[PDB]
Amino acid sequence: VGAXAXVXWXWXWXWX
Amino acid sequence: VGAXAXVXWXWXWXWX
Ligand SMILES: [Cl-]
Ligand SMILES: [Cl-]
Ligand SMILES: [Cl-]
Numbered sequence A, B: 001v002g003a004x005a006x007v008x009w010x011w012x013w014x015w016x
């Protein structure tokens, strides 16, 4: 739920 | 870690 795949913005986990 | 901002692939939480 929200839109896309899994959780947040991105590929992975954290920022970069 | 990974590449991006978060956890996963994209925007929010889940599949869509
Ligand atoms: Cl969704
Ligand atoms: Cl995601
Ligand atoms: Cl990341």
Ligand SMILES: [Cs+]
Pocket: A001, A002, A003, A004, A005, A006, A007, B010, B011, B012, B013, B014, B015, B016
């Ligand atoms: Cs999603």
Ligand SMILES: [Cs+]
Pocket: A007, A008, A009, A010, A011, A012, A013, A014, B003, B004, B005, B006, B007, B008, B009, B010
């Ligand atoms: Cs992410």
Ligand SMILES: [Cs+]
Pocket: A007, A013, B006, B007
């Ligand atoms: Cs996470």
Ligand SMILES: [Cs+]
Pocket: A001, B013, B014, B015
């Ligand atoms: Cs789900």
